[PDB]
Design a protein. Structure first.
Ligand code: HEM
Ligand SMILES: CC[C@@H]1C(=O)OC[C@@H]1Cc1cncn1C
Length: 463
């Protein structure tokens, strides 16, 4: 009645059929044997795995409500503990998601206000890149510093200074723990956390980075508290603190300190690392494909010129750039196995029975590479998103933000950011790699919770 799967063993589950370094390939390999909907045992964790566009959409959209539970990610769980918008369920989820979305729009998200803040931050990126003077640099932290400062404005009320030493450490905490969950040990940790949380190893260093992140947010919330102005909130924290006061006499409130810290961390973390990873990966692809870089240039120069900052609406007259960013997001597949769902009630899903509470892995990468939707899914080709007339072409299999009732509500911000950061950088610079285009390796460094591109250095050269 449960979907079919390989026969597990007590405690280790499907250990023998799973290569923890490449969980994605391991899971896809077994679906070729059992079909697109199958059961797996990640140690004692029983998970139903959804592969391909059809399986994922049918579950997460067509049976949207039944599949709207949030599952676990054991590493982030160590810090969040089911608190915060991301890992919440039921009433907690309802309240915090609703609140978060509204307060984000209230601070400019999806509006003129945050476009300007992205624009301003992009100029600061251009300045920093200008300052390198075309030298061979690691782009990692130039990018993350810029991305992070958009969401930081919303939640903390101001950007960090680029020379802020603490800001860099915050960014390292985010990079290191994100990377960890993408490694072989990280993915083993998803199977065996009940043991591994108490053992020495890479898990502990990731925990202490998560701890550093929690500590800063806690600290920021306290400062905000002692200086709070109930009539004029400066940031996301303030709005949340204001609601906490309004709800002090409701004993079943979801608005209390721990949910504040964790939601704030959720957004600071998700609002920094993913766009940063996507950008980092984008530029590596662009250097691998010099001819794609040239069309991006051709379009930018013809549509925007050189004398003004790119803006969000330039999107509509830039089908190629839109296709390029989509392909980067499709190819880069930053969240390859989505973020775990779970069934809200006993569920009938296409001839299978899934008991209430059953965890679900929506294999987002398998949709992004679904051969029914993209002609050459393993290649980087912006034509995946283009008409024969050269106009932009939507895809139902373009699901990097996932789909359904618990989909990424940072999508708006992220789309704007990607459009602005990519265009403004490509407008002002051309890219020079350390190695020859043929020698560049755009295969991932790590694939686990996230897809991480290999470490590289590069030059940003003025046009
Ligand atoms: C390229 C950029 C991004 C990608 C690819 C991405 C991807 C994802 C994915 C795959 C999920 C799981 C959705 C699901 O459960 O079906 C998710 C959830 C989430 N993301 Fe993003 N994200 C991005 C940027 C952002 C940003 C900028 C923010 C904050 C402004 C953000 C905040 C969140 C939150 C709060 C959730 C959980 C929503 C919930 O549980 O209700 N993300 N994201
Ligand atoms: C680590 C970032 C977010 C968090 O706090 O816990 C899980 C979540 C993952 C995520 C959501 N949107 C983008 N990412 C990378």
């Amino acid at each position: 009645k449960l979907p079919p799967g390989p026969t597990p063993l007590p405690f280790i589950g499907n250990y023998l059929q799973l290569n923890t370094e490449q969980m994605y390939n391991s899971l896809m390999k077994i679906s070729e044997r059992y079909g697109p909907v199958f059961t797996i045992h990640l140690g004692p964790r029983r998970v139903v795995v959804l592969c391909g566009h059809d399986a994922v959409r049918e579950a997460l959209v067509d049976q949207a409500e039944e599949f709207s539970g949030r599952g676990e990610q054991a590493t982030f769980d160590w810090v969040f503990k089911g608190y915060g918008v991301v890992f919440s369920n039921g009433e907690r989820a309802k309240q915090l998601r609703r609140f978060s979305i509204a307060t984000l729009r209230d601070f400019g998200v999806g509006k003129r206000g945050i476009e300007e803040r992205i624009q301003e931050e992009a100029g600061f990126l251009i300045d920093a890149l200008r300052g390198t003077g075309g030298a061979n640099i690691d782009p990692t932290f130039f990018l993350s510093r810029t991305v992070s400062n958009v969401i930081s404005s919303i939640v903390f009320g101001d950007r960090f200074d680029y020379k802020d030493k603490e800001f860099l450490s915050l960014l390292r905490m985010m990079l290191g723990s994100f990377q960890f969950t993408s490694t072989s040990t990280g993915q083993l940790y998803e199977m065996f956390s009940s043991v591994m949380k108490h053992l020495p190893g890479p898990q502990q260093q990731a925990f202490q980075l998560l701890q550093g992140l929690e500590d800063f947010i806690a600290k920021k919330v306290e400062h905000n508290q002692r200086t709070l102005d109930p009539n004029s909130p400066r940031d996301f924290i303030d709005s949340f603190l204001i609601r906490m006061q309004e709800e002090e006499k409701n004993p079943n409130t979801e608005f209390y300190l721990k949910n504040l810290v964790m939601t704030t961390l959720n957004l600071f973390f998700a609002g920094t690392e993913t766009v940063s990873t996507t950008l980092r990966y984008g530029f590596l692809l662009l250097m691998k494909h010099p001819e794609v870089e040239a069309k991006v240039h051709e379009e930018i120069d013809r549509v925007i010129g050189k004398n003004r900052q790119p803006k969000f609406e330039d999107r509509a007259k830039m089908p190629y750039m839109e296709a390029v960013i989509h392909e980067i997001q499709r190819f880069g597949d930053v969240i390859p196995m989505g973020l775990a769902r779970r069934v809200k009630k006993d569920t009938k899903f296409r001839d299978f029975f899934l008991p209430k509470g059953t965890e679900v892995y929506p294999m987002l990468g398998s949709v992004l590479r679904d051969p029914s939707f993209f002609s050459n899914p393993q290649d980087f080709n912006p034509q995946h998103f283009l008409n024969e007339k050269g106009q932009f072409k939507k895809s139902d299999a373009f699901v990097p933000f996932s789909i359904g009732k618990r989909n990424c509500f940072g999508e708006g911000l992220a789309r704007m950011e990607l459009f602005l950061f990519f265009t403004t950088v490509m407008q002002n610079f051309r890219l020079k790699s350390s190695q020859s285009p043929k020698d560049i390796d755009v295969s991932p460094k790590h694939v686990g919770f996230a897809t991480i591109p290999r470490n590289y250095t590069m030059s940003f050269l003025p046009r």
